[PDB]
Design a protein around this ligand. Sequence first.
Ligand SMILES: OC[C@H]1O[C@H](O)[C@H](O)[C@@H](O)[C@@H]1O
Ligand SMILES: [Ca+2]
Length: 586
Amino acid sequence: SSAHPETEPKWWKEATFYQIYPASFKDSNDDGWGDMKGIASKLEYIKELGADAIWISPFYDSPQDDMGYDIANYEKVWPTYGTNEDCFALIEKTHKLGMKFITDLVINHCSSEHEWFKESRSSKTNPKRDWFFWRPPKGYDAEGKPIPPNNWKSYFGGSAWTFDEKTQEFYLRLFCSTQPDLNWENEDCRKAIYESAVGYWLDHGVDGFRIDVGSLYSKVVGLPDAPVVDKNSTWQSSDPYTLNGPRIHEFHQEMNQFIRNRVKDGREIMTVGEMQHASDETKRLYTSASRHELSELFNFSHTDVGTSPLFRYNLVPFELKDWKIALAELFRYINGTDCWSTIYLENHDQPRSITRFGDDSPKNRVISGKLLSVLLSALTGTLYVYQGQELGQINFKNWPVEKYEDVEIRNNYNAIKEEHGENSEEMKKFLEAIALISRDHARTPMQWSREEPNAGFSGPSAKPWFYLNDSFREGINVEDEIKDPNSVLNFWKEALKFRKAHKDITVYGYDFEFIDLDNKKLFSFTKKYNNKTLFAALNFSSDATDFKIPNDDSSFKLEFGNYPKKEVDASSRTLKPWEGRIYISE
Ligand SMILES: OC[C@H]1O[C@H](O)[C@H](O)[C@@H](O)[C@@H]1O
Ligand SMILES: [Ca+2]
């Protein structure tokens, strides 16, 4: 383990994080929105699950055009969620339970309602004009409409620019129209960002930051037109010119130094960057401890499987190997380095992992939910569990498009309607995809009980901000799952206990090797820690599946699995449907 600097323990390496989506976690005042007092009331539940730390999605003052990721004030809690004092009380309560607290750092862009943007947009001559990207039209079209400065596509569909009537210029917004990109080329802007979004929260005791689209801060000079890679799309991906740009490491080093110099009590701060996509070299430049940039990053390959690289909302076939390789992208690069990795299958931007990677049928949703827990329990990195994942939550079914709340759905729908027609093959493919892939499958209220109609998220007379998934009626809820010894919730409790008990090789294990990589059903691997070997055999199918343990001997003991502990034959070399097993040899 000495030739593996990645094994050096840190609180944030071995902490299991639980991600809370504040709108949807727990309402305490029957207004249909989750809130801070709601979260506070459920910290014990989170601790009892086995979480060591929480990450709360944005709770700052926001118009909610992107459900909190459009921030109007970094230094004020959104009143619907509570007051600043409620937040400080929440941080303290989390701490007094022995848990760490990270907040969402959203500084690629702010709300157009932020005072910085209100000033910037007021004239062409004000001191904050160049805190954002303003450009004149590229002339006007045959209809008299201004033409945007370039052909870039918004992440949510359509053009990445919005015209401002007052100053007669476009501003850049890679996300929704009211999320103008901050200009990191402006040093005054960077310093103001650090003071408000970072320093304020360090001063109030956060243990770290989850850094929203942290790979987008550096724009290639000139904001050039992107090459035409999609011939059936008016607008083009800006990635070559916005993703992992030439100053991105400079910026992350600067912010890292700011954090180090701002902390007052010498505490260890974790940063997890939502970096989206990166080569292994880029990952190393971000996460090597000696680089003083990020602690770790999220990489999207594993959550991209089954989607077109050209458009997330066009489905394509995939096989198990594709997902194996994509998952391994999170962690293989750290082997024998001072880097660190993340492990997750769910967040507020993703559909449910049982639906995507297991089998969400009534017959198989429990066992396959447990299989996913066995897999995650054994992988190297900082583990994240997303609200409802521990309940074995599944995608909602048969929702009309008009029921979806997400701006990502609304904007993409409108762009397709405009470009291709509402009644088109393009729209049909889109509608097919949203049923599997929409971020909204993560965002329905947390299911605390079987109580009609709001499942204990809010009182029965309240109208939740977004519709409940019908699955609460099928026993996917906290109250019912606590009482069922066979539940996914109770299984996740066991999985976290297992992972912690064997943390040297589960959290810090190295020399990961696939066994039978090509297998369409068997997901198998080994890991090492000194004299120890972990061997995983995981059957991602309803068919029984054979496996072999490399260098098999008597020393391999069955330590964890999802079939009943008293009924598993550890010597057997065929997995039952959806069966997973972790063996450890010392
Ligand atoms: O802030 C724009 C986007 O950034 C990140 O990808 C967030 O996780 C996502 O929810 C948001 O829409
Ligand atoms: Ca509320």
